[PDB]
Amino acid sequence: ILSPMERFHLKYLYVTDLATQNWCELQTAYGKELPGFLIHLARELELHDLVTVPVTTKEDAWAIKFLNILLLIPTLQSEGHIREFPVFGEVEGVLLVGVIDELHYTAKGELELAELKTRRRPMLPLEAQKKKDCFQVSLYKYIFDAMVQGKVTPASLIHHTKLCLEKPLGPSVLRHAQQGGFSVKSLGDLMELVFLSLTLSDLPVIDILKIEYIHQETATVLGTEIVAFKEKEVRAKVQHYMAYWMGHREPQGVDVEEAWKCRTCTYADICEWRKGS
Numbered sequence: 001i002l003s004p005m006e007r008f009h010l011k012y013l014y015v016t017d018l019a020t021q022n023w024c025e026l027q028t029a030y031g032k033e034l035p036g037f038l039i040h041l042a043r044e045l046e047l048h049d050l051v052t053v054p055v056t057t058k059e060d061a062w063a064i065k066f067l068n069i070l071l072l073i074p075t076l077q078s079e080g081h082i083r084e085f086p087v088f089g090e091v092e093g094v095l096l097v098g099v100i101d102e103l104h105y106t107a108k109g110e111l112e113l114a115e116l117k118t119r120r121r122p123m124l125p126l127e128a129q130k131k132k133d134c135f136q137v138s139l140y141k142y143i144f145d146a147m148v149q150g151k152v153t154p155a156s157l158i159h160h161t162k163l164c165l166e167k168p169l170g171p172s173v174l175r176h177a178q179q180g181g182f183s184v185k186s187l188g189d190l191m192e193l194v195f196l197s198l199t200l201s202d203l204p205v206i207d208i209l210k211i212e213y214i215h216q217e218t219a220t221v222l223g224t225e226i227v228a229f230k231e232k233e234v235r236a237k238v239q240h241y242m243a244y245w246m247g248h249r250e251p252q253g254v255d256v257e258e259a260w261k262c263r264t265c266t267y268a269d270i271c272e273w274r275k276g277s
């Protein structure tokens with residue numbers, strides 16, 4: 001009987017879904033089952049799945065994302081700095097989608113991912129918040145590295161998104177592209193150029209994962225995290241997390257040492273884990 005992906009009618013998952021799954025897996029599950037409850041604007045517009053230019057078909061929305069990538073790649077390779085870079089790729093049988101906030105080259109020529117976290121109150125981030133945030137930026141590197149190394153193909157995206165390449169691209173898509181100097185023929189031709197540009201433009205793997213916490217008003221830095229990426233640990237975690245989404249195990253609540261997370265959880269009054277873990 002249905003897996004959570006089928007039950008919640010999810011064709012793919014967002015990077016933040018797995019980040020909040022690190023906070024509480026049951027809370028993330030309830031967030032998909034009961035969505036009626038529950039700034040980087042491109043990532044926020046991706047979570048509600050809005051898009052940059054008029055949003056009719058899903059082939060149009062993905063075509064816009066592909067045109068953005070084709071422009072951001074040479075911008076990064078010449079200006080050394082870009083923002084809001086879309087990432088996607090199949091991870092353990094599930095397509096993962098996200099938006100990297102900032103990519104730039106350090107003075108030593110290292111490709112650095114920057115993740116800025118603003119806070120209302122000038123308080124240090126919790127250990128549980130840093131665990132989750134470190135997992136999020138590690139996922140960005142996991143997907144990005146696979147993208148620029150040729151491990152993410154147009155076929156894999158079509159399989160999960162059910163994009164139709166027979167449907168021609170809308171005028172708002174073709175207008176956005178021609179105004180950028182590029183003439184898209186078909187969605188299939190666009191996807192093939194994205195693959196080429198991702199893999200043949202000398203894009204290195206991400207060298208630095210940097211998280212910065214800032215108090216908004218005073219601009220005071222509340223901490224800086226240089227994430228120690230270990231790909232074997234990262235893969236083990238997504239394997240475990242995707243095992244729930246694909247339906248191979250039951251969702252888990254928080255550990256008893258972190259029962260304080262339930263104090264401000266929307267679904268505390270219906271969670272059976274909160275009663276008997």
Ligand code: SF4
Binds near residue numbers: 272
């Ligand atoms: S009440 Fe606690 S265990 Fe249950 S979903 Fe919320 S955070 Fe998770």
